Amino acid sequence: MLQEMGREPTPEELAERMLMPEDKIRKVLKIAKEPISMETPIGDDEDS
């Protein structure tokens, strides 16, 4: 769809083409990410 479009297709456009409704799109979109490891120093310097 990107090649066809040249840009990012929307949840609705793919709700059409993937053949299922925006419920499940937005649903799965809520789900698919991973945990981010407490011990990361979001303090750029080693303080936090």
Binding site: G6, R7, R26
Partner: protein, 1340 residues
């Protein structure tokens, strides 16, 4: 002069005529960007460099490959403003032209084959402003040019490596631009060795054998063949006379029949000269001379094929006999004189065990691949891949060049790939250095060091994205179908763009900029480091590189450090310098000829400089002759001294070019120490814009250019006449010639009002200008937050005294009056924002609506139907500004509350609060807000209202735009017709479009009629597209995260006024902190009852010595005095000519000033308005080094009719009487800071805690407790406060039961203690036991 100069003139006292007007300043960043983008045909850079380096790419067959043609970028979808609005990165889209070329492999390359010569979108690309920045999620951010060690070749030696030796070892290092590294090294044992990438050692000769190679040609190469001839019994041997040089004669070295030399006798230069003289090459010599010498080459008996002696074998006399017998009355041998040409090679060779080339190949493999079973092609392909493959290896012929020069070749270019001659020439040169001829390199010298600008790094990221591409490419090429597989059927732009993102948001350099101060931003652009990948680290780095090198001069400001662990690592450039195109530097210099300084220029390197001999601009010319004094301070060789006059190559231009900008702007600092200088220029950046724009009156001169080049302001892009004005926009008519013919020449500028600084401070613009006035191009039209008339205003100048007062300025501390507070002048603004989200939950959607339970209606009052605040409201902590609620479950409770609600009996809610509220401890003003809602989620009531308001406002603005434009063009429409007949009122009253029927001169004019028709339609068409595009731009909803249904946000307005604790400083180190404001009556004051503004403690100066602040003070009293002369003359309302004399006199006062000016040139109201501008005090420029002089402070305080001592009898605010002695008085220009108690101080009673450890938190933002270091505990170790110890160990921190106990006991009045045991203890014990041991407690 120019218009804005005329309005306010700053005097100057530099006298040395400068040659140069400064360049543009941020040229470097924009140029690297340009380089990266710009379509280089041939010198491939950045993009084209990448595609060229990589493409074409083919498959495994010999049919199919992919072929570059060209590329293109598009316009951005989003303008700049919508991007930072939406929190969107700005960028441009990308197309590239690809040709899927294949070849008929049945044919040889029967190229009439499938071709998909088409175009491909992939990935947008963030882009630069016309100013430099990149916005990321609407976050203007900056990335900085770095320096690193230039590639190539670098030699050195360490002093003391083994303790028994305590001696030096010479060693080499080299790298390419790309690919693996390589290391030559000696040992103490006079042997070269080798390692790659610091792999383990090798005798270099192993690899030499690896190079298709034999020992024969070694010994041909490195050494001469010391030839013998056994002429039937006895040894005769050839001899160049200069082989025996400083050599002790072993035997009675003689001739045909002549002794030049006895045994044990040094062969002087004389005997060499005799030997030379008499043409004597061969000498009768003892056979014994040989034994110990080494054969040159493998010799055999031809019948045998067997070595009577192997090559690289010491010689003897049994072998002498044997060889003479075998048919050898000549013997080459190896030359060896440590004086002349001595042994290192054969040492390593006899050490070199690997017998054949293949032993070399395999052991080289085996170090390269230890454990792994060697095969032939493994090692072969391996070695060639390392340094003979174009792919994994390049020099970036800057390298290649450098290597020619490290070899002194003719050439400069080549491949990115080695040759063997290069290698051995390095080997030879290295051993030559070992012998003493030549040197090793230096460090901290700038020709060893190369920059890294942006497009370089962009390019690197780009091509590694092409790696992440090309793997998958190759597979799907060799594997998939060939006829059907489109070029983009394989393409994944995702890792490419994602890596662009990673670098743009996770690099060390991707950074938020400092727009608190145009100084701070612009210098932040002009910062440089050595950090990150291919960089260094604090704990690993040391001292020497932080320090100065002489060759910084003219190229680096040495003044510029952050006062922290980056003591010398960080540093910014200087002023007038430039880059070598390669990534090194240059600097201009005035050529000097015959004594005559040539005004020409040559941007010399760090390297050419030391050769020549070069002069200062401090010199006093002999009026276009030569230098006046014989002993001229010249410099060459990396050092300066005194030489004659015609003896000069070059000269400097100006006395500043060493400096940076914040370094440049401090006057008199030649009279001042450096520590206070650098911390001053540091604090010079941390400044804050005040409410208004007060200038200084002491200057340097450059500040105009800085007020320009940030791009913060408007400019006269083109001169013209002011057309229309507003407090948010201003229109100009462009001059006729500056107006292009196709163009209407009507510029506008819509102006940035109240707006967020990244450090949360207020932003505006305002016209410093009037209407109906001419303007020459480049003039500024609206000043900025910290600027005035195109010049800086970081602070405010005002009154001072230097004396103690009752302890109220004890240690650098400050006292002030109250008057300032009544003038509010050091008052400023801030901005504070908040936000909220409409999510969807498992249970349902979070609802945004005014409806709430348990409603203290007080704050509900200011909310609307949808639960939203009305604009112009005033608030404070805890107030409720947005009503959001959440689908809730239900709960249960204890019998006591059950009975409670049973007697109350309020009922039935299954929804929970999620409303937004002000932080406790804040109060501000409501200004502006915004909602984002999905394109697909319905736009709420006021959401539609706001977007309707926006379509209104925008459509109004664009209506006005095209309206005015269209009037501008209907001007032409009416004008062009008037001299063909006339329809004087037959034209006007009847409708406009029906003028096409009136009097017509049939021949030509109908084309005009239908061209009028054409433009009438064209214009409304252009508005139609404007309308539709803009309206869809406005109405299109939001690409919001999953669950995020819509969000509102809010911006406040807050001000803050002065209070003790708010730091304050000027430009001289002159810090200080406040203890008090003072009533005006308490002011000590003068005979004339004018009290003072500031008092200061004169203790510390003769130790810190920022003495320019004194001269400044003198001048600060001085300058204003003239403004008062004039101000009286204005109120007294005197005359033109009086002031005219007064003033031109005042200008043409100093000794030998460079600037020269007239009045009579100018007309009257010009005089009036500059006089209006100067009444507060005439401003002045002190060039920091060629400033004015005390004679011109004193001539001047005279004219002000003051004590030239500048020091006065004053009287006491409290007692009225005179003090002992006088005190110096005058004005200095002062600054206040970010460091301010309101954002700084904090208290923490009791609140949140940690989770694993139950411990109080840190940070005022989350109500942070203050940690105590353990040395604070050591304190009461030395005191013995066991109970406070207990307290602060246990109850304030960890013990839950303890903290609770204490809470309730205090509210009982009870001040009594109870311990528990810290949670962390047991936590450990558990962890320990998880590590798997039985720790345990021996209970009592």
């Amino acid at each position: 002069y120019s218009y804005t100069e005329k309005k306010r003139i700053r005097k100057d006292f530099g006298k040395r005529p400068q040659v140069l007007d400064v360049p543009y300043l941020l040229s470097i960043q924009l140029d690297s960007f340009q380089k990266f983008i710009e379509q280089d045909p041939e010198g491939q850079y950045g993009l084209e460099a990448a595609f060229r380096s990589v493409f074409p790419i083919q498959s495994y067959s010999g049919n199919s490959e992919l072929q570059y043609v060209s590329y293109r970028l598009g316009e951005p979808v989003f303008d700049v403003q919508e991007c930072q609005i939406r929190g969107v990165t700005y960028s441009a889209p990308l197309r590239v032209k690809l040709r899927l070329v294949i070849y008929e492999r049945e044919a040889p390359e029967g190229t009439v084959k499938d071709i998909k010569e088409q175009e491909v979108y992939m990935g947008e690309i963030p882009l630069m402003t016309d100013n430099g920045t990149f916005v990321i999620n609407g976050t203007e951010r900056v990335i900085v040019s770095q320096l690193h060690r230039s590639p190539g070749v670098f030699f050195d030696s360490d002093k003391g490596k083994t303790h028994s030796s305590g001696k030096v070892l010479y060693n080499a290092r080299i790298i390419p631009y790309r690919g693996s590294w390589l290391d030559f090294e000696f040992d103490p044992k006079d042997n070269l060795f080798v390692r790659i990438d610091r792999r383990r050692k090798l005798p270099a000769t192993i690899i030499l054998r690896a190079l298709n190679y034999t020992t024969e040609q070694i010994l041909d190469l490195f050494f001469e063949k010391v030839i013998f001839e056994i002429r039937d019994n006895k040894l005769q041997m050839e001899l160049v006379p200069e082989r025996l040089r400083g050599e002790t004669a072993s035997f009675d070295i003689e001739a045909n029949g002549k002794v030049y030399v006895e045994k044990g006798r040094r062969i002087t230069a004389r005997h060499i000269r005799q030997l030379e003289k008499d043409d004597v090459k061969l000498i009768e010599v003892p056979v014994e001379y040989i034994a110990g010498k080494v054969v040159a080459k493998d010799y055999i008996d031809e019948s045998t094929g067997e070595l009577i002696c192997a090559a690289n074998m010491e010689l003897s006399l049994d072998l002498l006999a044997k060889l003479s017998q075998s048919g050898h009355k000549r013997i080459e041998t190896l030359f060896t004189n440590d004086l002349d040409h001595g042994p290192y090679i054969s040492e390593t060779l006899r050490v070199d065990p690997t017998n054949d080339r293949l032993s070399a190949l395999v052991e080289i493999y085996r170090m390269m691949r230890p454990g792994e079973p060697p095969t032939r092609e493994a090692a072969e392909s391996l070695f060639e891949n390392l340094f003979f493959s174009e792919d994994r290896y390049d020099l970036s012929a800057v390298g290649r060049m450098k290597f020619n020069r490290s070899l002194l070749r003719e050439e400069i270019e080549g491949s990115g790939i080695l040759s063997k001659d290069d290698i051995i020439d390095v080997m030879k040169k290295l051993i030559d250095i070992r012998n003493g001829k030549g040197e090793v390199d230096d460090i901290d010298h700038l020709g060893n060091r190369r920059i890294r600008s942006v497009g370089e790094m962009a390019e690197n990221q780009f091509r590694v994205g092409l790696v992440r591409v090309e793997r998958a490419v190759k597979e799907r090429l060799s594997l998939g179908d060939l006829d059907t597989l489109m070029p983009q059927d394989m393409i994944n732009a995702k890792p490419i763009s994602a890596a662009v993102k990673e670098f743009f948001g996770s690099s060390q350099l991707s950074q938020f900029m400092d727009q608190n101060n145009p100084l701070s931003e612009i210098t932040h652009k002009r910062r440089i480091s050595a950090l990150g990948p291919g960089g260094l680290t604090r704990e690993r780095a040391g001292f020497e590189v932080r320090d100065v090198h002489p060759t910084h001069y003219g190229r680096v400001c040495p003044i510029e450090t952050p006062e922290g662990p980056n003591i010398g690592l960080i540093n910014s450039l200087s002023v007038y310098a430039q880059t070598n195109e390669y990534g090194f530097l240059e600097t201009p210099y005035r050529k000097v000829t015959d004594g005559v300084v040539t005004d020409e220029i040559h941007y010399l390197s760090a390297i050419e400089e030391g050769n020549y001999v070069i002069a200062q601009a401090n010199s006093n010319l002999d009026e276009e002759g030569h230098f006046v004094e014989d002993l001229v301070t010249c410099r060459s060789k990396g050092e300066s001294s005194l030489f004659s006059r015609d003896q000069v190559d070059y000269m400097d231009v100006s006395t500043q070019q060493v400096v940076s900008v914040g370094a440049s702007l401090i006057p008199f600092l030649e009279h001042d120490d450096a520590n206070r200088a650098l911390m001053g220029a540091n604090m010079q950046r941390q400044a804050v814009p005040t409410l208004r724009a007060d200038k200084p009156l002491v200057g340097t001169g450059m500040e105009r250019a800085v007020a320009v080049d940030s791009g913060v302001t408007a400019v006269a892009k083109r001169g013209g006449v002011v057309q229309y004005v507003d407090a948010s926009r201003i229109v100009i008519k462009v001059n006729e010639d500056e107006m292009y013919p196709g163009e209407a020449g009507i510029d506008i500028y819509n102006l940035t009002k109240y707006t967020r600084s990244n450090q949360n401070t207020c932003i505006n613009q305002m016209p410093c200008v009037s209407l109906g006035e001419p303007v020459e191009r480049g003039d500024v039209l609206a000043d900025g937050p910290s600027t005035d008339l195109g010049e800086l205003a970081l602070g405010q100048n005002m009154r001072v005294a230097f004396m103690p007062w009752n302890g109220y300025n004890f240690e650098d501390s400050i006292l002030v009056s109250e008057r300032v507070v009544q003038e509010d002048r050091f008052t400023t603004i801030h901005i504070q924002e908040l936000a909220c989200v409409s999510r969807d939950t498992k249970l349902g959607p979070e609802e945004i609506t005014a409806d709430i339970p348990n409603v203290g209606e007080a704050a509900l009052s200011k909310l609307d139907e949808s639960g939203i605040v009305y604009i112009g409201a005033e608030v404070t902590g805890g107030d409720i500004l947005v009503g959001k609620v959440t689908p809730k479950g239900e709960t249960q409770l204890t019998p006591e509350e059950k009975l409670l609600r049973a007697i109350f009996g309020e009922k039935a809610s299954d929804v929970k609060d999620s409303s937004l509220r002000v932080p406790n401890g804040v109060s501000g003003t409501v200004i502006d807000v915004q909602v984002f809602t999905r394109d697909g989620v319905e736009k709420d009531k006021r959401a539609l209202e706001i977007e309707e308001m926006q379509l209104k406002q925008a459509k109004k603005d664009l209506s006005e735009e095209l309206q005015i434009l269209e009037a501008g063009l209907f001007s032409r429409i009416r004008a062009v017709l008037v001299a063909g007949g006339v329809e004087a009122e037959k034209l006007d009253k009847l409708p406009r479009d029906r003028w096409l029927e009136l009097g017509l001169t049939d021949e030509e004019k109908q084309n005009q009629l239908e061209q009028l028709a054409e433009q009438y339609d064209e214009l409304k068409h252009e508005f139609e597209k404007k309308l539709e595009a803009k309206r869809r731009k406005i109405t299109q909803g939001d690409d919001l995260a999953p669950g995020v249904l819509k969000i509102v946000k809010v911006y406040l307005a807050v001000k803050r006024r002065i209070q003790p604790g708010d730091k304050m400083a000027g430009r001289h180190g002159n810090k200080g902190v406040i203890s008090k404001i003072n009533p005006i009556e308490d002011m000590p004051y003068d005979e004339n009852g004018t009290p003072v503004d500031i008092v200061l403690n004169p203790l510390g100066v003769p130790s810190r010595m920022n003495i320019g602040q004194i001269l400044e003070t003198h001048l600060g009293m001085a300058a204003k005095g003239i403004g008062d002369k004039i101000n009286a003359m204005l109120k007294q309302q005197q005359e033109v000519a009086k002031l005219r004399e007064f003033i031109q006199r005042a200008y043409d006062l100093g000794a030998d000033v460079r600037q020269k000016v007239d009045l009579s040139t100018f007309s009257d109201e010009e005089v009036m308005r500059l006089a209006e501008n100067l009444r507060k005090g005439m401003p002045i420029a002190t060039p920091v080094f060629d400033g004015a002089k005390e004679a011109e402070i004193k001539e001047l305080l005279k004219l002000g009719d003051l004590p030239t001592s500048g020091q006065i009898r004053l009287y006491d605010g409290r007692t009225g009487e005179q003090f002992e002695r006088p005190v110096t008085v005058g004005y200095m220009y002062m600054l206040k800071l970010n460091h301010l108690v309101d954002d700084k101080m904090h208290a923490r009673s009791t609140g949140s805690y940690s989770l694993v450890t139950q411990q109080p938190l840190g940070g005022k933002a989350q109500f942070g407790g203050q940690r105590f270091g353990e040395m604070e505990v050591w304190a009461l170790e030395a005191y013995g406060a066991a109970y406070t110890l207990q307290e602060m160990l246990t109850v304030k921190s960890d013990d839950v039961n303890g903290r609770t106990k204490m809470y309730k006991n205090i509210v009982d009045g009870n001040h009594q203690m109870e311990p528990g045991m810290p949670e962390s203890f047991n936590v450990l014990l558990k962890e320990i036991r998880s590590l798997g041991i039985n720790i345990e407690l021996e209970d009592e």
